[PDB]
Amino acid sequence: ARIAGINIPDHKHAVIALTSIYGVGKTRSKAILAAAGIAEDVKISELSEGQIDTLRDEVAKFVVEGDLRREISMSIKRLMDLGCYRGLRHRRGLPVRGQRTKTNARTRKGPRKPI
């Protein structure tokens, strides 16, 4: 119950449980779970240490959790300091992908501000 530096739930199936890793989704969960031949209908509570080690070996094949987040920051930071249009849209807390701004855009702006 210690994979990729985080704790994982024990009472759910493997496919549901492994997606809790930052960077591992449902497709990635299935790929990892099938790469070592473990069924999707087994709780990790009842499972042995050797195949846990194999699961760790297979999940160690991607940039996940903190090692991912790092470059994401630079992926944003290089955009901000370069001075491009996306950097300016990032600075002001406004949409970057050319959506509406006359209305909506609450998620990028937050709750309404009474004057």
Partner RNA sequence: GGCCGGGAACUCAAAGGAGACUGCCAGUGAUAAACUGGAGGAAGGUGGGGAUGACGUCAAGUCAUCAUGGCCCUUACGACCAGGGCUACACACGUGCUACAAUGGCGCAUACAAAGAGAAGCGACCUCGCGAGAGCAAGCGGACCUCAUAAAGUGCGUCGUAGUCCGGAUUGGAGUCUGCAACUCGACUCCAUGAAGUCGGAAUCGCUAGUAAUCGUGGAUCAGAAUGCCACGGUGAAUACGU
- Owner of token pair 């901000």: 80
Q: What are phi and psi of 98, to 5 degrees?
A: 65, 40
Q: What are phi and psi of 25, to 5 degrees?
A: -105, -165
Query: What token pair was written down for 83?
Result: 């001075």
Q: Which does 88 bind (CB under 5 to 8 A by kind): other proteins, RNA, none?
A: other proteins
Q: Which of residues 18-37 bind other proteins (CB under 8 A)?
A: none
Q: Is 88 in the site for other proteins (CB under 8 A)?
A: yes
Q: Three-class SS of residue 76?
A: helix
Q: Is 96 in the site for other proteins (CB under 8 A)?
A: no
Q: Which residues bind RNA (CB under 7 A)?
A: 11-13, 16, 19, 21-29, 41, 68, 72, 75-76, 79, 85-86, 90, 94-103, 105, 107-109, 112-115
Least distance to RNA, CB of residue 57, Å: 18
Which stretches does DSSP call E strand in the chain? 2-3, 6-7
Give me the residues that bind other proteins (CB under 8 A), please.
Answer: 78, 82-86, 88
